[PDB]
Each structure stands twice: as structure tokens, then as C-alpha cells.
């Protein structure tokens, strides 16, 4: 059971999300982007993109990639 | 009768919208985005996106998702 | 004859536009957006979107919807 | 109670959708478009856009506009 | 009173639209495009774009331009 | 445990996907779209969009919505 | 000979452009937008859109519309 | 006076447009594209793009570039 | 050394690409899409998207995801 | 002097373009796409994309990449 | 040999780029835009668009147009 | 073995990325852009685009081009 998504983080702050993700995935390379940002298709097993809203809350389920 | 949309909130401030939505749906995870922002198709029964205008008023009918 | 568009407001300030629209349509729910913003297809008989330019002047004919 | 949306038509054929909509709204001007097509913001009280999928089934809730 | 828009043509066939527009504006240069097509901002007093749906019916109000 | 996604269907034909989804969710309203198609944010608990590739194989994880 | 475009204004400031356009077209309704902004197809004989760059210089030929 | 645009060709067929352009600009490299197609910013003094509609009529003013 | 990309397949046919990929990754779920198609960010360790050109040749480096 | 662009091929057929490019760059991996197609930023020293128009003529300067 | 592109300016500041371009093309009308900005197809022999990055460095080869 | 990509820089600051890239490629012309920015297809063997997130960390694998 590999932890690959954090549905429990939707609506939480980016600071709380970073803390949780690094506890579950200490190698995570955390990227913080506005919702709607276009990204590439290249997969990175250690990257976790956090898509944030106007108040810097997690707006979409974080996933590895 | 499940409360899934708030047409009565269009034109209201984000503060008033948050207060109303949390009264009707105490588990709501409220996300605040500019109008026009592209989002994912993943459904979250407890998320309510608020799409706001230049004056932080609700610009589209809030819906669960 | 239902007032549904304000061609006379193009180039006017948002403050003047709001004043005129509310005189003609006292129930108007006025939304202020940058020109070019993508919106939904849902119709709201009482909403009037004002699309503004860099100087907060009305850039497109306001219409109900 | 004005009939303005047909959630019951999602997944149905365009022929069945047209028949139902014209029964409920005999003045309907029915437009048939692929899902994802960009449209204008102009409101037409008698227009009903049907957004269809690859098999010509209704893919989104038809609404007046 | 210059005829610049044909709201009465929404939902009609392109053949019927062409016939009506040329009666009202004999100099019209009629262009037939799919709904959603991006066009330029250049204005042509004699051009009338007809935006058509999957069944070649007029999907948006024809306007001069 | 509500069945809301079918990761096991990626790469399978649309016919096989429809058969599996209707077994798991007999009320499913199945919509078949090309990959990349833009859709609305409205949630439909009984809709399952199938996004297909050039060979009509499932290209993305089907999800309810 | 109707003045409908100002190629001579490309690269000039918005202040200088406004002054020239109003001399040539005293009824002009001047709209100031960033380059690349999407606009509507509706034609307004008295509107002149000025598309400006990062330094508020005219980046495209102003035209009536 | 360099011939750089053919407003007189809007609404004409691509065959008639090609004939006229090659008479005025015998070195023209004529490219035929659907309206709305995105192109590059590279300038080619001898290229003339013809943007055509559903009936292969010229939909926008041809220009050199 | 996990095989995750096939730069050697650019320009090859989709049939040859499928044969090579399945030799290197027998569990591959092969998806065939036109170049430029927008996809989701969800990662699937067993999916390989093949982006093809007008002649069904591989146009971009296939990668797992 | 490395041959990296073929401005002389604009307006020529794809067959003639392929013949010329392979004479100048025998290792070329030739990709044929419609004008306007979005591609990735990954550089391939041996790939040459040919962007073609409705008549399969070269519409943009071919370049290596 | 007409100077129409400045590959040597990529990565340089906008101030240095302006100085070089005006030395080579004293009539240049210099426009400064963010990378990615959509522009029109109209050609202006004296315009040079500078597309800049987050640090106001030249991000793409300046070209006349 | 030509150094053309820096997967090890994902998640690192732009300052650290610049230092590493210039050590490996002293001729690098470093461009700093927001994630999602559209760029041209022109290849520059000495350019390295750094796509950064809201916190100015490298969000995508830097590559030459």
C-alpha cells in the first residue's frame, strides 16, 4: 500500500499539507502552484504538486507525480 | 432533499457565502478561486468551490463537488 | 420591453455602470470581472456581469445573464 | 415553476431529448453541439443547447439559454 | 435603424439564414463557421458570420462584423 | 465502500468498460468522449464519463461525476 | 475615407494614443487592455480598444470596433 | 504602395482568392487553413495565409506574413 | 534501471512502437492519442501514452504514466 | 554551419519537403502535424516537425527539434 | 542582408536588448511582453516584440514583425 | 554524454538551480518562467528554461532548449 494521494488535505493550509505529506513521504519534493496551472506529463515518483486557492488552501487532492 | 447548490449566494461576499454554506453543510471544505479557473473533474462530496469576482463577490452558483 | 443590455455604458466607469443598472434593474446582482474571463453557461435572470478594462471602465456591453 | 433544466435527459439520445424538451417548452430552439464547445454569453430564453457525446447522447444537463 | 443582428434566425438552417440576411443586407459576405471558432477582431461592415451547430442550424445570433 | 472509480478499465475497450461499470453501478449514465474534452463542473452521482483514445480504448480512469 | 485604424500609434504611450484617437474620432470610447486579452465579436462603431504592453505602450494597431 | 492585404477577397472562394493574389504577388506562397488556427509569429514576406470557412470561402482579410 | 521512456521510438509507426514497448514492459496499457491532446495529471505506472502524428507515427518520446 | 531550418520549403508539398530534408539531414525523423498543434518542449536533435495546411503544404518553416 | 532576428539577445536584459536593437534598426518600435502572450498575425516591418521572463530577461529570439 | 536535463533540481530554489546548471553548462542562458507558460518551438542549444512555482522552486525538470 503506497501512499500516493492525500484526499484528507483538501481545504487545509499549504503549511499543514506540507507537514502531513513529509511525514508520509519524507522524500517528497513539494511544488506549490495555483489551481488551473498547466503542467507537463513527465512523472516524478517523488514530486507532490499542491494546487492552492486564493487563500493558500489545498484545492485539489494532492497526488504523487 | 440534499443541499447541493446555493443560487441565493450569487453577488454576495465570500464571508457571507462561507457562513451560509457552513450552516447548511457543516462538513463543507470551502475553496475560493477566481472566476474562470480551470479545475479537475474529481468529485468531492464535501468540497464547495466559491468562484469570486474582482470584488470578492460570488460570481457563479456555488455547488458541491 | 425588458431592459437586458446597456450598450450606453461601454467606456463608462464601473461606479457609473452600477448606478445606472440598479436604477433600471433594482434586483441586479452585479459581478465585476476582467475582460476575457471565462464564465459558465448557467443563466441568472438577475445577474449582470460587468467586464472591465485596465482602468476599470466597461469594456463590453453589459447584459443580463 | 419555469422548466429551465432537464437533468433527466443526461445519457439519453438527442432524438429523445428533443422530443421531451419540445413537450415541456414548445417554443424551444434546439441547438446540438459537441461537448466542450465554447459558446457566447448572450442569453436566449427560447434556446436549449444539447451537448452530445461521441454516440450522440446527452452529456450535460440541458438548460435554457 | 441599421439591421445589424438577426436573433430571429437562431435555430434556423443555414440556407434559410442566408436567404433572410441577403434580403435585409444584399451586400452581405456570408461566412459559415462551427460554433466556438476563434476569429479576429477586424471589423467588416459587410461580413455576417453564421455560427452553426452539428446539424447546420444557426446556433448564435448572427451579427454584422 | 462506494464504487466511484475504475482504474482497472484503463486500456480496455469501451464495450468492456460499459459492461463492467453497469455491473457495478446499474444506474450508470455512460458518456463517451474523446480524451481532452472540456466538461462542466456540475456533479451527477449517476454519470460515468469514459474518455477514449483513437482506438476507442479507455484512456483515463473512469470516475463517477 | 473613415479613420478606422491607427498604425502610427504602435509603440506610443497610451496617453499619446488617447490624445490622437480623440482628435480623429471625438466620440471614441477608449478601452485599455493587456495584449492577448480575449474579447467578444460584437461590433461597436465608437469603441477603440488599445492593447498595451508591460510598459503601457501600444502593442497592436488600434482599430475601431 | 506594396500590396499587403486583400479585403476584397472576404467571402470569395479559395480558388478565386489564389488567382487574385498570384496576379498581385506572383511570388506568393499560399497557405490554406481553417479559421481559428493558431500560427507562429515568424514573418515571411512571401507567404499569404488564407483562412477559410466550412464552405472554403475566405473568412478573414488575407494579409502577407 | 527501470525502462520509463522510449526515445528510440520517435518517428516509428504505432505498430512498431507497441511491439517494442510490450517487449520491454509486458504489463503496458497502451493509449494512442493525437499530438497535442490534453490529459490528466493522474499517474498510472503501467500506462504508456503514444502521441501520434497525421501518419500514425510516434511524434513525442513515449513515457510511462 | 549546421542545417537547422528550411525556409525554402514553405508552401511546398510534404512529399517534396521530406525529400529535401532527408537529403540535407539523412537521420531526420520526420513528423507531420496540422498547423496549430501543441507540442512538448523536449528537444530531439534528429526530429523535424512538418506543420501542414489543409492541402498538405508546408505552412511554417521546418526546424530541427 | 536585412537584420530581422537577434538570437544573440536571448538571456540578456530588456535594457541591453533595446540598446542593441535600436543600433541595428533605428526605426524599431519596441514592445515588451511576458512570454506566452498571444499576439495578432498583422505584420509591422518596424515592430520588434521582446518577450521577457520573470527577471525581465529576453526569453525568446527577438524578431521583426 | 551531454548534460541536457537536471532532474536532480526539481524542488530546489532557482538560486541553487542556476548555480548547478552554470557549473555543468557554463554557457547556459537561464530563463525563469512561471509553470504553465507557453513557449516557442525554436531550439537554442544554450538556453535552459527554469519553470518555477509560487515559492520560486523548480517545478519541472530543467532541460536544454
Author numbering:
A (entry chain A), B (entry chain A), C (entry chain A), D (entry chain A), E (entry chain A), F (entry chain A), ...: 2 to 66
Paper lines:
As scaffold for implementing fold-switched allosteric assemblies, we chose chymotrypsin inhibitor 2 (CI2) from barley seeds. The small (<70 residues) globular single-domain CI2 is a paradigm of two-state folding in which a sturdy native structure unfolds at an extremely slow rate via an all-or-none transition. The CI2 native structure contains a four-stranded β-sheet and one α-helix connecting strands 1 and 2. The C-terminal β-strand is inserted in antiparallel fashion into the sheet’s middle, breaking an otherwise parallel arrangement to form a unique fold that is specific to this family of serine protease inhibitors.
To identify possible spatial arrangements for assembly, we analyzed the crystal lattice of CI2 by X-ray crystallography. CI2 crystallizes in the hexagonal space group P622 in all the conditions we attempted that rendered crystals. On the lattice, the protein forms double hexameric rings in which the two rings are packed head to head and rotated by ~30°. This spatial arrangement is strongly predefined by symmetry, and thus we identify the toroidal D6 particles of the crystal as the target for engineering a CI2 assembly. The lattice also reveals that inter-monomer contacts are few and feeble, both between ring neighbors and across rings (left), explaining why the protein is monomeric at all conditions outside the crystal. Indeed, crystals obtained using salt as primary precipitant follow the standard arrangement of early structural work on CI241 (left), whereas crystals grown with PEG feature domain-swapped dimers arranged in the same lattice structure and group symmetry (right). In solution, we find that CI2 is monomeric at concentrations up to the millimolar range and remains monomeric even after unfolding partially at high temperatures.
